[PDB]
């Protein structure tokens, strides 16, 4: 039942270059359930005939203008080679946004197309009636903002994808849309502090990665109070799981956080001498092979984050205090912890000579008591029963504790700047009804994946479980429980991999936590208990190469191999109490507030707990999903890799979405919410307290004269199609006094 053009799985140009997965060919002969003789044209290289079975042949969508179809579902033929070609043609014409049911897909162009300027914001925000432009992320922003004010219910925009897909860039674009309000008038200062925060959060939190030159090394969540006619009034920012290990070491092709390069390269000579700023090559903490990020002007961002500090109401004392801590964090890595005498195996740690001259100058930059810190890095008081002993630290421990100071100072400074931001911006009353935004670090894969990547990929798995539960599991169950539709909706879940990773027991994070709670623990003993706590699952497997320390997980985006070397050390990377209480007693105001109020606390345990707390908040809101896709690995514009596109389409469930059109209606809201959203259609039916909400909704629907097939009444909700929601919003045009 197919036309004259087919897509081919077994073709000459696809068997020769499997990365491009399909060829388009015109059928010259054949029959139903017989072999077909056809020649391919879309790769014009092969001008000769060949044969293909009846299978491995899909319809083409030959006559469509792909620039006129905004949704994948609206295409006549929605098979894999059609969806791939549909997104390709639109992407080659610089149209990257394409909707799929509630989902919206955004493909990285790797260049500013100019489609997010202020003129585009105005055209998507205030064009009368409804959105009849092309799909966009401004689609999501306006629909979510309209839903917010129409029902008084919190919404949450959630971007997703892999590293370098455009999650953060889409987030910044939606903030620019929300911040645009030419209809009303407000005080600019709070909104300007929110927008000016984006540079400093990317300076302190982002760094060059082979997968993304501006990779966010932290997750971001934002609650927003967006005005009715646009404009941002209040907000709050939360950053979780900053990767402190990046402060110490980096791969050869990567950089540390941008702020180190902005400072060393952009600081004036007076500032360099003031905070003892060395060139980047003379910092052990800075990878000297890669000092340049292709898309970033480090000197331009340096003056950008300097002006941003003023918009966030940081006094000149605090700004100078921040640069001192940044330089102090860098200089601390130059302190060599030399091995000294009076050690058991000549292993005792100490700082001497030129290292102590550097150590004193670094502590002064960090505003710390030098000799009190030095004692905590060198001597270790222990208790063999009732015997107090002033033993020494081995060189290994003293060096880790020294680097631990630099990481905690940088980690807490990043949180303190955000906390300074929230004090100036958080709403005076509180957050009851808000606009949520989630900017999570995406899936990432390297030749060597440590705990930094393990946590990041686990966050992405939990989001997908929350995606599948909300969009597929809850929706399919809700329709059946309402009596609207009994449908056999089948999909791909990640419930088994999320269990063997995050459960209370019989999971990787559980085996990690128990290993760190032991007096004597090893990375290999942690992987050992993983191999047998539960091995009856294909989601966890011992790696094929070096299986004593390496393991791999069968993720939703493929298989990823991790190595446990350093898991315990990195999972227990908390500043010691005896060192933390020294930086608390600093006479410098900002340093004294970094650890203020502090007197279980493992990263993996305190980070999964925050994820659950954030999952509970977000699920109290109505979610909107943006699926960001990276079309190539070379970051080249107009570069299209069909094999990579298809992997992300399965991972983000863009193809599996299309089932949702078969699941009845697109609008589903309780009777009371519906009567409030369209109350002016029949005020006698909506504002009558002595009425039954199902009859009142029916009276309002029958007053709207909406056709019968465009709505339905469930047991406790009113369902209606995409056509019915458009009309009711339009009918609310009557003018009351
Ligand atoms: N819509 C877009 N327009 C132009 N460039 C983009 C767009 N989305 C992503 N990019 C480019 O891709 C890079 C990575 O985007 P980013 O949002 O950091 O990815 P991630 O999803 O990892 O946060 C950015 O530096 C930017 O240059
Ligand atoms: F900056 Al990313 F995933 F690389 F959010
Ligand atoms: Mg990001």
XYZ file of C-alpha atoms and ligand atoms in Angstrom:
770
model
C 0.000 0.000 0.000
C 2.867 2.346 -0.878
C 3.641 4.874 -3.593
C 6.261 5.028 -6.324
C 9.065 6.405 -4.122
C 10.429 4.387 -1.204
C 13.056 4.709 1.484
C 15.478 1.792 1.551
C 17.275 -0.013 4.368
C 19.232 -2.278 1.968
C 20.603 0.115 -0.666
C 24.037 0.743 -2.231
C 24.736 4.148 -0.671
C 23.672 2.982 2.814
C 25.632 -0.274 2.742
C 28.717 1.764 1.778
C 28.243 4.637 4.267
C 26.088 3.262 7.108
C 26.171 6.585 8.991
C 23.589 7.865 6.524
C 20.915 5.260 7.145
C 18.446 5.610 4.261
C 18.303 6.299 0.531
C 15.332 7.543 -1.495
C 14.605 5.628 -4.700
C 11.929 5.558 -7.412
C 10.254 2.197 -8.007
C 10.368 0.983 -11.615
C 8.775 -2.472 -11.207
C 7.534 -4.940 -8.629
C 4.363 -6.284 -7.065
C 2.619 -6.591 -3.717
C 4.683 -8.768 -1.354
C 7.369 -9.238 -3.985
C 10.797 -7.805 -4.648
C 11.008 -4.291 -6.091
C 13.410 -2.934 -8.716
C 14.316 0.702 -8.091
C 17.074 3.295 -8.520
C 18.098 5.868 -5.909
C 18.259 9.621 -6.504
C 18.465 11.459 -3.175
C 22.078 10.300 -3.032
C 22.623 11.035 -6.736
C 25.841 9.020 -6.837
C 24.203 5.757 -7.936
C 22.536 6.121 -11.346
C 22.213 2.335 -11.815
C 19.375 -0.064 -10.935
C 19.199 -2.426 -7.973
C 16.667 -4.591 -6.133
C 15.055 -4.430 -2.685
C 12.623 -6.789 -0.874
C 9.031 -5.805 -0.105
C 10.129 -5.122 3.453
C 12.878 -2.535 3.974
C 10.762 -0.153 1.876
C 8.854 2.793 3.349
C 6.688 5.548 1.906
C 8.378 8.841 1.232
C 6.096 11.900 1.697
C 7.050 13.005 -1.798
C 4.911 16.092 -2.466
C 5.180 17.832 0.922
C 6.685 21.253 1.480
C 8.354 20.450 4.831
C 8.368 24.158 5.750
C 4.551 24.112 6.062
C 4.209 21.219 8.549
C 5.007 22.210 12.121
C 4.304 18.876 13.812
C 5.756 15.424 13.157
C 2.281 13.959 13.596
C 0.765 15.979 10.750
C 2.960 14.244 8.153
C 1.151 11.599 6.047
C 3.961 9.058 6.580
C 5.647 9.193 9.994
C 8.124 6.318 9.706
C 11.786 6.680 10.703
C 13.326 7.670 7.318
C 10.506 10.185 6.805
C 10.945 11.819 10.223
C 14.722 11.946 9.730
C 14.410 13.578 6.303
C 11.680 15.928 7.554
C 13.876 17.350 10.318
C 16.881 17.450 7.972
C 15.196 19.578 5.291
C 13.885 21.998 7.920
C 17.292 22.117 9.622
C 19.055 22.825 6.320
C 16.609 25.739 5.890
C 17.484 27.038 9.398
C 14.177 25.896 10.938
C 15.271 23.915 13.995
C 12.039 23.874 16.032
C 9.469 21.153 15.353
C 6.712 20.032 17.702
C 5.642 16.480 18.504
C 2.433 16.359 20.551
C 3.224 18.299 23.800
C 6.942 17.864 23.055
C 9.010 20.365 21.071
C 12.306 19.494 19.364
C 15.198 21.959 19.050
C 18.212 20.990 16.927
C 21.500 22.808 17.548
C 22.446 25.053 14.587
C 25.892 25.912 16.054
C 25.480 29.520 14.870
C 23.241 32.457 15.746
C 20.447 32.207 13.184
C 19.008 35.491 14.459
C 15.662 33.826 15.208
C 15.659 34.768 18.919
C 16.141 38.538 18.596
C 13.786 41.061 20.178
C 11.726 41.359 16.982
C 11.056 37.609 17.026
C 10.151 37.807 20.723
C 7.611 40.551 20.021
C 6.156 38.629 17.074
C 5.729 35.482 19.183
C 4.491 37.306 22.298
C 1.802 39.807 21.281
C 0.537 38.832 17.825
C -3.229 38.855 18.235
C -5.287 35.651 18.497
C -3.162 32.461 18.588
C 0.284 31.228 17.569
C 0.221 30.583 13.822
C 3.954 31.065 13.365
C 6.440 28.220 13.044
C 7.288 26.137 16.129
C 9.727 27.735 18.548
C 10.833 27.699 22.148
C 8.722 30.859 22.378
C 5.827 28.504 21.637
C 6.572 26.790 24.950
C 7.096 30.066 26.817
C 3.817 31.679 25.749
C 1.688 28.544 26.156
C 3.152 27.957 29.624
C 2.806 31.626 30.582
C -0.782 31.690 29.302
C -1.639 28.496 31.200
C -0.164 30.078 34.338
C -2.386 33.166 34.355
C -5.475 31.410 32.975
C -5.815 28.824 35.768
C -3.450 30.223 38.428
C -1.347 27.051 38.435
C 2.432 26.788 38.415
C 4.147 25.651 35.220
C 7.660 24.315 34.667
C 9.671 24.352 31.438
C 12.117 21.439 31.253
C 14.848 21.250 28.625
C 16.611 17.944 27.999
C 19.219 16.371 25.761
C 22.900 15.492 25.708
C 25.942 17.682 26.288
C 26.073 20.441 23.687
C 22.499 20.119 22.412
C 21.319 23.588 23.455
C 19.611 23.152 26.819
C 21.199 26.258 28.345
C 20.915 28.344 25.168
C 17.191 27.581 24.983
C 16.897 28.456 28.680
C 18.532 31.844 28.096
C 16.248 32.454 25.105
C 13.119 31.763 27.167
C 14.343 34.121 29.898
C 14.881 36.834 27.279
C 11.304 36.210 26.131
C 9.886 36.412 29.661
C 11.947 39.530 30.408
C 10.447 41.334 27.379
C 7.457 43.463 28.455
C 6.672 46.517 26.338
C 2.981 46.307 27.288
C 3.465 47.184 30.964
C 5.918 49.104 33.123
C 7.895 47.797 36.103
C 11.096 48.428 38.029
C 13.941 47.126 35.873
C 16.374 46.397 38.700
C 15.222 42.945 39.842
C 14.800 41.641 36.288
C 18.172 43.121 35.308
C 19.801 41.261 38.203
C 18.317 37.978 36.953
C 19.562 38.492 33.393
C 22.980 39.715 34.560
C 23.319 36.521 36.615
C 23.648 34.335 33.508
C 27.272 35.421 32.785
C 28.556 34.852 36.329
C 26.822 31.471 36.610
C 28.486 30.427 33.347
C 31.812 31.934 34.434
C 31.869 30.076 37.761
C 29.954 26.974 36.675
C 30.766 26.285 33.019
C 33.982 25.063 31.415
C 35.327 23.825 28.096
C 34.471 20.188 27.359
C 35.173 18.161 24.216
C 31.403 17.595 24.035
C 30.596 21.292 24.629
C 32.827 24.368 24.747
C 30.444 26.036 27.231
C 29.449 22.932 29.187
C 27.514 23.633 32.379
C 29.142 21.624 35.184
C 26.109 22.083 37.458
C 22.352 21.682 37.397
C 20.142 24.761 37.525
C 16.568 25.293 38.690
C 14.734 28.622 38.564
C 11.414 29.716 40.024
C 10.071 32.835 38.322
C 7.309 35.399 38.822
C 6.668 36.500 35.234
C 4.323 39.424 34.719
C 0.889 39.020 33.192
C 1.933 40.987 30.086
C 5.510 39.724 30.334
C 8.418 40.985 32.370
C 10.111 39.261 35.303
C 9.252 40.498 38.803
C 10.783 37.961 41.213
C 12.819 34.779 41.064
C 15.134 32.319 42.761
C 18.123 30.306 41.537
C 19.343 26.892 42.715
C 22.573 25.217 41.592
C 23.353 21.634 42.583
C 26.347 19.311 42.199
C 29.052 21.702 41.083
C 31.948 19.538 39.918
C 34.724 20.521 42.309
C 37.151 17.975 40.822
C 37.456 20.250 37.777
C 39.143 22.847 40.008
C 42.076 20.462 40.524
C 42.698 18.704 37.200
C 41.415 18.746 33.628
C 41.869 16.630 30.528
C 44.295 17.786 27.847
C 41.549 19.103 25.542
C 39.461 20.705 28.313
C 39.676 23.828 30.460
C 38.843 24.617 34.060
C 35.941 26.941 34.868
C 35.794 30.063 32.707
C 36.327 32.464 35.618
C 39.976 31.435 36.027
C 40.743 32.385 32.420
C 38.608 35.538 32.516
C 40.595 36.746 35.530
C 44.146 35.830 34.499
C 43.670 37.148 30.950
C 41.431 40.156 31.609
C 42.633 41.545 34.934
C 44.420 44.886 34.865
C 48.056 45.104 35.931
C 46.935 46.811 39.145
C 44.571 43.915 39.876
C 47.166 41.286 38.930
C 49.621 42.746 41.445
C 46.868 43.187 44.043
C 45.729 39.543 44.128
C 49.067 38.026 43.003
C 47.703 36.709 39.712
C 50.141 34.526 37.762
C 49.964 33.603 34.075
C 47.912 30.507 33.334
C 50.978 28.415 32.462
C 52.375 28.817 36.002
C 49.310 27.319 37.737
C 49.505 23.583 38.403
C 45.704 23.610 38.719
C 45.380 24.965 35.152
C 45.853 22.616 32.189
C 48.464 24.498 30.118
C 47.801 22.712 26.813
C 44.350 24.288 26.293
C 43.953 27.941 27.325
C 41.461 28.951 24.609
C 37.748 28.269 24.146
C 36.617 28.748 20.530
C 33.290 30.492 21.121
C 34.396 32.525 24.152
C 36.278 35.817 24.437
C 37.663 35.468 27.962
C 38.533 39.171 28.211
C 35.065 40.201 27.013
C 33.345 37.938 29.552
C 35.629 39.261 32.302
C 34.267 42.786 31.923
C 30.783 41.304 31.470
C 30.887 39.531 34.841
C 32.379 42.656 36.436
C 29.394 44.773 35.384
C 27.116 41.878 36.359
C 28.361 42.070 39.955
C 27.019 45.632 40.142
C 23.591 44.592 38.844
C 23.474 41.921 41.583
C 24.176 44.541 44.302
C 27.630 43.328 45.348
C 29.584 46.120 47.011
C 33.114 46.870 45.831
C 34.453 45.194 48.979
C 32.702 41.928 48.099
C 33.753 42.088 44.435
C 37.408 42.501 45.413
C 36.901 39.759 48.001
C 35.610 37.391 45.306
C 38.608 37.917 43.013
C 40.919 37.304 45.980
C 39.273 33.949 46.717
C 39.427 32.987 43.031
C 43.151 33.751 42.866
C 43.681 32.134 46.264
C 42.040 28.948 45.000
C 44.381 28.961 41.993
C 47.542 29.751 43.965
C 46.874 27.028 46.550
C 47.597 24.363 43.925
C 51.165 25.619 43.539
C 51.843 24.709 47.190
C 53.920 21.525 47.048
C 53.341 19.383 50.134
C 56.907 18.134 50.495
C 57.611 14.928 52.376
C 59.572 15.555 55.565
C 61.491 13.651 58.223
C 60.068 12.426 61.593
C 57.689 10.174 59.643
C 57.047 6.475 60.196
C 58.194 5.493 56.703
C 59.562 8.978 55.951
C 56.052 9.813 54.754
C 55.054 12.772 56.949
C 53.673 15.868 55.231
C 54.903 19.441 55.648
C 55.149 22.793 53.873
C 58.628 24.317 53.814
C 60.786 26.952 52.179
C 59.400 28.485 49.005
C 56.185 26.467 49.330
C 55.505 28.148 52.683
C 56.064 31.572 51.117
C 53.435 30.625 48.530
C 51.225 28.984 51.168
C 51.215 32.141 53.300
C 50.429 34.369 50.312
C 47.622 32.021 49.241
C 46.020 31.877 52.692
C 46.136 35.673 52.801
C 44.192 35.729 49.540
C 41.729 33.212 51.008
C 41.629 35.340 54.203
C 42.655 32.410 56.399
C 44.932 31.977 59.400
C 47.958 30.427 57.706
C 49.661 28.617 60.588
C 46.357 27.272 61.919
C 45.630 25.833 58.465
C 49.173 24.461 58.155
C 48.802 22.515 61.406
C 45.560 20.968 60.129
C 47.309 19.860 56.920
C 50.404 18.370 58.591
C 49.812 17.024 62.118
C 46.983 14.609 62.944
C 45.964 14.173 66.574
C 44.678 10.644 67.197
C 43.494 8.654 70.217
C 44.668 5.065 70.749
C 42.089 4.505 73.453
C 42.836 6.983 76.230
C 46.262 7.856 74.773
C 46.332 11.149 72.899
C 48.894 11.110 70.087
C 50.211 13.989 67.973
C 50.957 11.930 64.904
C 51.545 13.326 61.439
C 49.683 13.259 58.145
C 51.200 11.267 55.321
C 52.087 13.274 52.225
C 49.129 11.714 50.399
C 46.563 12.841 52.974
C 48.054 16.297 53.526
C 47.943 17.039 49.799
C 44.320 15.932 49.402
C 43.314 18.032 52.415
C 45.146 21.017 50.912
C 43.365 20.596 47.578
C 40.135 19.895 49.485
C 40.389 23.426 50.879
C 40.620 24.954 47.398
C 37.622 22.974 46.124
C 35.338 23.742 49.074
C 36.222 27.447 48.953
C 35.399 27.551 45.240
C 32.263 25.444 45.720
C 30.902 27.565 48.573
C 31.843 30.848 46.881
C 29.739 29.754 43.906
C 26.821 29.063 46.253
C 27.359 32.311 48.178
C 27.133 34.423 45.010
C 23.845 32.707 44.156
C 22.620 33.207 47.722
C 23.508 36.899 47.407
C 21.478 36.912 44.186
C 18.435 35.286 45.798
C 18.340 37.742 48.710
C 17.840 40.607 46.248
C 15.290 38.823 44.044
C 13.240 36.287 46.012
C 9.627 37.506 46.337
C 8.827 39.375 49.569
C 5.976 37.041 50.486
C 7.054 33.744 48.988
C 6.494 31.328 46.125
C 2.938 29.997 45.836
C 2.306 30.213 42.069
C 5.442 30.429 39.941
C 7.037 29.727 36.565
C 9.601 26.951 36.939
C 12.653 26.331 34.764
C 15.086 23.397 34.894
C 18.512 23.593 33.214
C 20.120 20.191 33.871
C 23.497 18.981 32.622
C 22.902 16.525 29.801
C 24.134 13.025 29.045
C 27.892 12.957 28.502
C 30.343 10.230 27.494
C 34.147 10.352 27.532
C 36.976 7.882 27.065
C 37.192 7.861 30.881
C 34.004 8.492 32.874
C 34.492 9.170 36.585
C 31.993 10.035 39.325
C 31.375 13.441 37.725
C 29.830 11.735 34.687
C 28.129 9.022 36.756
C 26.048 11.537 38.713
C 25.280 13.599 35.601
C 24.030 10.578 33.650
C 21.969 9.470 36.662
C 20.251 12.871 36.762
C 19.381 12.442 33.085
C 17.962 8.967 33.739
C 15.782 10.242 36.594
C 14.430 13.049 34.400
C 13.455 10.528 31.721
C 11.677 8.394 34.323
C 9.814 11.525 35.416
C 9.137 12.276 31.740
C 7.772 8.809 30.949
C 5.690 8.647 34.134
C 4.060 12.042 33.551
C 3.577 12.013 29.781
C 2.884 8.294 29.188
C 2.168 6.381 32.411
C 0.027 8.991 34.180
C -1.775 10.141 31.025
C -2.673 6.655 29.776
C -3.870 5.712 33.265
C -5.777 8.981 33.724
C -7.783 8.558 30.513
C -8.779 5.014 31.493
C -9.712 6.037 35.044
C -11.836 8.906 33.682
C -13.676 6.621 31.255
C -12.477 8.677 28.292
C -10.422 6.070 26.421
C -9.219 2.511 27.027
C -6.036 2.478 24.939
C -3.127 0.012 24.854
C -0.433 2.680 24.962
C 2.990 0.988 24.938
C 6.321 2.770 25.333
C 9.904 2.444 26.567
C 10.501 2.960 30.288
C 13.766 3.147 32.226
C 12.319 1.759 35.461
C 14.771 -1.148 35.676
C 17.928 0.921 35.182
C 16.746 3.607 37.624
C 16.082 0.923 40.254
C 19.494 -0.747 40.016
C 21.044 2.718 40.296
C 19.045 4.730 42.846
C 17.072 2.343 45.081
C 17.454 2.307 48.857
C 19.076 -1.134 48.614
C 20.295 -3.372 45.768
C 21.556 -0.438 43.707
C 24.847 1.187 42.754
C 24.304 4.371 44.778
C 23.317 2.222 47.764
C 26.466 0.104 47.485
C 28.460 3.333 47.144
C 26.900 4.794 50.295
C 27.524 1.710 52.447
C 31.146 1.550 51.275
C 31.751 5.164 52.328
C 30.114 4.547 55.729
C 32.710 1.830 56.505
C 35.974 2.547 58.369
C 38.022 0.712 55.757
C 36.614 0.990 52.252
C 37.882 0.541 48.713
C 36.730 1.405 45.210
C 37.155 -2.251 44.226
C 35.166 -3.512 47.219
C 32.371 -1.138 46.195
C 32.341 -2.592 42.686
C 32.545 -6.074 44.221
C 29.332 -5.681 46.224
C 27.664 -4.250 43.105
C 28.546 -7.417 41.170
C 26.508 -9.592 43.554
C 24.033 -7.429 45.520
C 21.827 -7.956 42.480
C 23.305 -9.467 39.319
C 20.020 -10.680 37.826
C 19.729 -7.519 35.732
C 21.085 -6.725 32.269
C 21.266 -3.017 33.161
C 24.410 -3.480 35.287
C 27.295 -5.452 33.792
C 30.994 -5.873 34.604
C 33.072 -4.163 31.935
C 34.872 -6.302 29.363
C 38.203 -4.497 29.942
C 39.698 -4.432 33.448
C 36.509 -5.587 35.229
C 37.889 -5.103 38.758
C 37.539 -1.306 38.604
C 35.540 -0.712 35.383
C 31.788 -1.221 35.038
C 29.203 -0.157 32.479
C 25.506 0.735 32.588
C 22.932 0.139 29.843
C 21.531 3.671 29.766
C 18.600 4.987 27.732
C 21.051 6.684 25.330
C 23.312 3.626 24.938
C 25.918 1.839 27.025
C 28.372 3.903 29.083
C 31.470 2.492 30.796
C 32.536 3.960 34.142
C 35.608 3.325 36.275
C 35.346 3.340 40.064
C 38.902 4.561 40.795
C 38.407 7.519 43.126
C 34.686 6.982 43.772
C 35.020 6.889 47.564
C 37.496 9.780 47.681
C 35.296 11.952 45.461
C 32.028 10.925 47.143
C 33.469 11.862 50.558
C 34.916 15.162 49.261
C 33.681 17.374 52.089
C 35.815 19.939 53.884
C 36.856 18.576 57.271
C 35.246 20.107 60.343
C 38.629 21.101 61.780
C 39.445 22.966 58.552
C 35.928 24.339 58.030
C 35.890 25.863 61.520
C 39.023 27.829 60.575
C 37.489 29.428 57.478
C 34.385 30.120 59.583
C 36.513 32.131 62.034
C 37.882 34.323 59.235
C 37.690 38.066 59.828
C 36.709 38.554 56.163
C 32.923 38.932 55.766
C 32.268 36.810 52.664
C 34.669 34.041 53.720
C 32.993 33.896 57.136
C 29.619 33.351 55.424
C 30.722 30.554 53.066
C 30.234 27.874 55.748
C 28.059 29.922 58.110
C 25.733 28.041 60.446
C 27.260 24.593 59.849
C 28.529 22.378 62.666
C 24.727 11.555 55.877
C 26.847 14.351 54.408
C 28.201 12.317 51.497
C 27.708 13.817 48.045
C 25.765 10.914 46.538
C 23.340 10.823 49.483
C 22.829 14.590 49.886
C 22.474 14.941 46.089
C 19.873 12.224 45.494
C 17.902 13.670 48.415
C 17.882 17.091 46.742
C 16.787 15.465 43.474
C 13.786 13.883 45.203
C 12.966 17.202 46.885
C 13.142 18.896 43.476
C 11.127 16.104 41.843
C 8.367 16.622 44.420
C 8.228 20.378 43.777
C 8.231 20.037 39.984
C 5.518 17.360 39.935
C 3.233 19.819 41.750
C 3.399 21.919 38.552
C 2.337 21.410 34.943
C 5.407 20.397 32.896
C 6.475 21.497 29.427
C 9.219 19.491 27.725
C 11.821 20.725 25.232
C 13.856 17.985 23.535
C 17.251 19.355 22.488
C 19.133 17.344 19.855
C 22.738 17.703 18.696
C 22.881 16.912 14.956
C 26.647 16.338 14.695
C 29.738 15.739 16.818
C 31.908 18.322 15.009
C 29.872 21.396 16.087
C 29.699 22.416 12.391
C 26.624 24.288 11.129
C 24.433 22.448 8.602
C 26.329 19.234 9.459
C 23.829 16.367 9.623
C 24.546 12.872 10.957
C 21.410 10.712 10.549
C 22.747 7.967 12.830
C 23.251 10.426 15.693
C 19.856 12.039 15.072
C 18.112 8.659 15.271
C 19.807 7.754 18.569
C 18.526 10.931 20.233
C 15.035 10.596 18.736
C 14.663 7.225 20.470
C 16.266 8.455 23.700
C 14.088 11.572 23.981
C 11.016 9.502 22.965
C 10.174 11.895 20.122
C 9.032 8.990 17.937
C 7.149 7.277 20.774
C 5.338 10.562 21.451
C 3.236 10.221 18.277
C 1.065 7.653 20.086
C -0.387 10.537 22.125
C -2.513 11.677 19.172
C -4.323 8.338 19.446
C -4.924 9.069 23.156
C -8.079 11.088 22.603
C -7.868 14.725 23.630
C -5.152 17.310 24.257
C -6.832 19.364 27.022
C -7.812 17.728 30.314
C -8.687 19.850 33.340
C -10.975 19.378 36.359
C -14.455 20.878 36.327
C -13.585 23.677 38.757
C -10.454 24.697 36.832
C -12.308 24.621 33.505
C -15.145 26.768 34.857
C -12.574 29.322 36.029
C -10.531 29.296 32.812
C -13.527 30.077 30.563
C -15.848 31.672 33.121
C -17.027 34.524 30.883
C -18.603 32.172 28.320
C -21.563 31.668 30.683
C -21.136 33.552 33.959
C -24.484 32.274 35.258
C -23.112 28.732 34.883
C -19.536 29.343 36.076
C -20.075 31.684 39.052
C -23.112 29.895 40.530
C -22.134 28.298 43.881
C -25.341 26.215 44.141
C -24.554 24.108 41.050
C -22.853 20.801 40.341
C -19.527 21.422 38.548
C -20.139 18.690 35.961
C -23.554 20.137 35.103
C -22.156 23.676 35.290
C -19.357 22.752 32.882
C -21.910 21.117 30.580
C -24.091 24.232 30.800
C -21.053 26.361 29.947
C -20.003 24.024 27.126
C -23.547 24.002 25.742
C -23.560 27.803 25.949
C -20.310 27.889 23.964
C -22.021 25.827 21.220
C -18.826 23.834 20.792
C -19.527 20.801 18.568
C -20.122 17.544 20.404
C -17.060 15.708 19.076
C -14.721 18.483 20.289
C -15.120 17.692 24.007
C -16.001 14.963 26.493
C -16.861 14.732 30.194
C -14.883 12.303 32.325
C -15.768 11.209 35.832
C -14.101 14.281 37.357
C -12.505 16.160 34.423
C -13.629 17.762 31.164
C -11.605 16.581 28.170
C -11.600 18.412 24.850
C -9.598 18.353 21.642
C -7.017 20.813 20.342
C -9.729 22.412 18.199
C -12.062 22.915 21.159
C -9.461 24.650 23.323
C -8.713 27.148 20.550
C -12.383 28.088 20.194
C -13.214 28.565 23.886
C -10.215 30.877 24.309
C -11.478 32.883 21.328
C -15.111 33.029 22.478
C -13.851 34.823 25.591
C -14.072 38.109 23.675
C -17.203 39.667 25.207
C -16.721 43.075 26.830
C -18.077 43.443 30.375
C -18.840 47.083 31.253
N 19.566 27.724 19.371
C 20.899 27.905 19.205
N 21.378 28.867 18.385
C 22.698 29.056 18.213
N 23.645 28.321 18.824
C 23.307 27.321 19.672
C 21.882 27.053 19.915
N 21.823 26.027 20.782
C 23.098 25.670 21.071
N 23.984 26.440 20.411
C 25.461 26.323 20.495
O 25.787 25.076 21.113
C 26.630 25.276 22.250
C 26.189 24.403 23.415
O 24.883 24.790 23.835
P 24.450 24.539 25.364
O 23.093 25.154 25.614
O 25.624 24.890 26.250
O 24.311 22.936 25.345
P 23.837 22.111 26.640
O 22.560 21.439 26.200
O 24.991 21.168 26.875
O 23.648 23.174 27.696
C 26.530 26.743 22.625
O 27.812 27.262 22.991
C 25.996 27.431 21.387
O 27.065 28.120 20.732
F 26.185 22.668 29.305
Al 25.501 21.019 29.238
F 24.814 19.373 29.150
F 26.955 20.463 28.358
F 24.045 21.577 30.102
Mg 23.936 23.526 30.139
